[PDB]
Design a protein around this ligand. Structure first.
Ligand SMILES: N[C@@H](CCC(=O)O)C(=O)O
Length: 258
């Protein structure tokens, strides 16, 4: 009867508490999604075990083998009951799993080292001296692969064959790469994560341009699962109560450094 919660380490959604060497199970982690977890549980009614996805990925279906990896996979292949993390709600995913009403909104955005000669996605697509990429197995990559919009199509045609690879394994790798590339690498990632990093020392990154799209994160559960209707109801209620906004103040604004 214990629901197993699959999630991923992504600041400030899920972070290792500073004294993680000890404290067991769910007491080891902290962050927005951890708090959201508890709330959903207390409101929906049930206990849960927080588990960090093995492959540390969000979720992509290998075109060749039609096999889903990451959190989406662990949901489609009975390895987890519910996914509570910043998992983007998308068309292709809504065909093999179920999402609640979004609990937070976001859009793809651009992160550059301060002083980089880039002010927009169009700027990036009209030059080549500055490389750029996204997270390897997430929705941002797939957004570009699929885009029909001229600019993003052009950006994708560049990214897929870019050498060396512009794709990263984690958000931290993308960010690091932006910081250690002397203004020669731009990173495309979701605004939520982009804005968090922007308010954290060394305060050398920046967000330029507007969001490239509008999307939402949602609690995910297996097709026709048992919690489906409940969680959506819990989410709508927390949204109603205004508790999701408060969690946002807690983890984003009340912790700026620049
Ligand atoms: N939120 C994305 C991961 C981050 C990204 O793709 O930029 C997903 O659920 O795949």
């Amino acid at each position: 009867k214990t629901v197993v919660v699959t999630t991923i380490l992504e600041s400030p959604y899920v972070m290792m508490k500073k004294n993680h060497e000890m404290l067991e199970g769910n007491e080891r982690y902290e962050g927005y999604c951890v708090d959201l977890a508890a709330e959903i549980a207390k409101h929906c009614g049930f206990k849960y075990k927080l588990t960090i996805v093995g492959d540390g990925k969000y979720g992509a279906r290998d075109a060749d083998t039609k096999i889903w990896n990451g959190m989406v996979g662990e949901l489609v292949y009975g390895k987890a009951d519910i996914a509570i993390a910043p998992l983007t709600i998308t068309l292709v995913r809504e065909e093999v799993i179920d999402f609640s009403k979004p609990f937070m909104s976001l859009g793809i955005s651009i992160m550059i080292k301060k002083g980089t000669p880039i002010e927009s996605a169009e700027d990036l697509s009209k030059q080549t001296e500055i490389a750029y990429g996204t997270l390897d197995s997430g929705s941002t990559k797939e957004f570009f692969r699929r885009s029909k919009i001229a600019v993003f199509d052009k950006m994708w045609t560049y990214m897929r064959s870019a050498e060396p690879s512009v794709f990263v394994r984690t958000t931290a790798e993308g960010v690091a790469r932006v910081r250690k590339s002397k203004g020669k690498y731009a990173y495309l990632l979701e605004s939520t994560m982009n804005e968090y990093i922007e308010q954290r020392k060394p305060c050398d990154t920046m967000k330029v341009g507007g969001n490239l799209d509008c999307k939402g994160y949602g609690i995910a559960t297996p097709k026709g699962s048992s919690l489906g209707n409940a969680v959506n109801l819990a989410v709508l209620k927390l949204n109603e109560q205004g508790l999701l906004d408060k969690l946002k103040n807690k983890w984003w604004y009340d912790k700026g450094e620049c």
